[PDB]
Each structure stands twice: as structure tokens, then as C-alpha cells.
Amino acid sequence: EYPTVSEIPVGEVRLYQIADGVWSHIATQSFDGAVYPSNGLIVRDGDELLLIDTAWGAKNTAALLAEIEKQIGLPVTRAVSTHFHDDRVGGVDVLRAAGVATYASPSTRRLAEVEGNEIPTHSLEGLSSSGDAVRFGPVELFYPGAAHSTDNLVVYVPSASVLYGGCAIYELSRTSAGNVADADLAEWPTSIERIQQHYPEAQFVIPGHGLPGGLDLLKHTTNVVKAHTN
Numbered sequence: 206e207y208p209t210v211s212e213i214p215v216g217e218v219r220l221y222q223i224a225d226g227v228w229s230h231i232a233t234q235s236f237d238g239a240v241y242p243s244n245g246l247i248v249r250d251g252d253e254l255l256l257i258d259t260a261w262g263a264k265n266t267a268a269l270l271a272e273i274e275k276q277i278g279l280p281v282t283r284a285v286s287t288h289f290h291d292d293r294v295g296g297v298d299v300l301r302a303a304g305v306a307t308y309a310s311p312s313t314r315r316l317a318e319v320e321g322n323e324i325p326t327h328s329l330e331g332l333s334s335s336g337d338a339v340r341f342g343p344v345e346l347f348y349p350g351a352a353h354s355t356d357n358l359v360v361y362v363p364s365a366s367v368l369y370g371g372c373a374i375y376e377l378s379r380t381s382a383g384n385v386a387d388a389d390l391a392e393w394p395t396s397i398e399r400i401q402q403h404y405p406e407a408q409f410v411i412p413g414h415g416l417p418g419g420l421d422l423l424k425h426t427t428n429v430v431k432a433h434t435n
């Protein structure tokens with residue numbers, strides 16, 4: 206069973222096998238007077254691992270690295286953060302200290318700095334216009350356009366048909382819009398249309414927070430966003 210928020214103490218990290226060579230990582234953090242769960246991705250990259258997103262802070266990200274070593278035992282050599290919020294970049298300094306080369310788009314890096322969050326080291330080229338895609342080892346990085354944030358990226362693992370939607374995609378049980386302070390509500394449905402057009406064969410869809418599903422999460426998110434606007 207996919208681990209839920211009440212099952213993970215703050216400071217612990219779980220790994221969940223999605224497909225051969227693909228895991229999600231699940232952590233929890235104090236936020237908005239509560240504790241929330243948060244997902245990232247781990248993808249086998251030959252003899253190394255590619256990490257998608259931190260585990261929401263330095264302490265959790267240290268626990269993530271320890272759990273990866275215990276359960277997988279291959280080195281994390283690169284990480285990509287999919288937008289500038291702290292659930293995506295908080296912990297990049299720990300990753301760097303562990304030998305991980307950390308990456309994000311130039312926009313994400315600038316936005317993180319202004320927000321006071323940690324800053325991935327390296328800039329990803331080729332992702333500045335909506336619909337841009339680039340290969341990054343065993344994944345494709347895709348910029349669908351503004352949605353939950355202006356900089357949000359999605360990640361596709363072609364060998365496993367896994368679409369990591371990040372925070373632009375809501376889990377099914379989230380039926381009202383969450384944090385829209387950094388969102389583009391008018392563009393978000395169109396950005397989801399771009400994701401659907403690009404990845405119609407996705408078999409697993411991972412949201413930034415909560416339970417994985419399938420491509421049904423895309424239409425669900427569109428419906429939630431539009432209901433907020435209407």
C-alpha cells in the first residue's frame with residue numbers, strides 16, 4: 206500500500222516501488238499548521254541514480270539518502286528540482302555535500318533565491334518555452350507551461366511509462382484547489398492539455414503530494430482548478 210501522511214513521522218522517508226528501476230520517495234513536513242506528505246522520484250540511471258526533487262528539507266533529505274543507500278545501494282549522482290518551492294529544493298545543500306550534482310531551470314533557480322530557499326547548482330538549458338522537452342539520462346524533462354507555479358516541470362520515464370506530474374497534478378482525493386499564490390489559474394488547464402498531448406501512453410501518474418494514479422489525475426486536476434476559478 207502507498208504510505209499515507211499519518212504513517213510517516215516528520216524526519217523519516219519511505220521508498221515505494223512503482224516499476225522496475227523507478228521509485229517514489231515519500232516524506233512529511235510541518236506546513237500551514239499541519240503535517241503534509243510530499244513525493245519525489247528516483248530513477249535508475251545505469252549504475253547510478255537520478256533523483257527528482259528533495260524530500261522537503263535538509264533533515265528529510267538526509268534521511269532520503271540514508272534510505273536509498275539501505276534499500277537500493279547505488280549512488281545518487283544527479284538531482285533535478287521541478288519547481289522553486291521548498292518541498293522541491295529544500296535539502297539541495299545536503300545533496301551537494303553528499304556529492305550530488307543538483308539541477309533546475311534558470312527560472313527555478315532565480316525564484317528559489319528570491320523566496321529564500323536553497324538553490325540548485327546547475328542550470329538546465331532548453332526548457333524556457335511551454336512545450337519544451339529535453340532528455341536527461343533515463344528521463345525526459347518537460348516544461349508544460351505555468352500551472353501550480355510558473356516554473357513547474359514534469360518528468361517522464363519512457364522505459365516504464367511513468368509520468369511524474371509533480372505539484373502541477375493533484376491526487377484524486379484533493380477536490381478543492383490548494384496553494385494558488387504562485388499559480389497561473391488561467392494557464393493551468395492548457396498546461397495540462399500539453400502534458401496529455403505529449404504523454405498519452407503514461408501508465409502511472411505521480412502527483413507532488415498524495416496517492417499515485419493514472420492519466421485520470423490530469424482531467425481531475427483540470428476540474429479542480431476550473432472549479433476554483435468558477
Ligand SMILES: O=C(O)c1cccc2c1C(=O)N(Cc1c(F)cccc1Cl)C2
Nearest residue numbers: 236241290291292293372382383384414
Ligand atoms: O500546493 C499545495 O496546496 C501544497 C500542498 C501540500 C504541501 C505544499 C503545497 C505547497 O504549495 N507547498 C509550497 C510551500 C509554500 F507554499 C510555502 C512554504 C513552504 C512551501 Cl514548501 C507545500
Ligand SMILES: [Zn+2]
Nearest residue numbers: 288290353372
Ligand atoms: Zn509548490
Ligand SMILES: [Zn+2]
Nearest residue numbers: 292372413414
Ligand atoms: Zn508541492
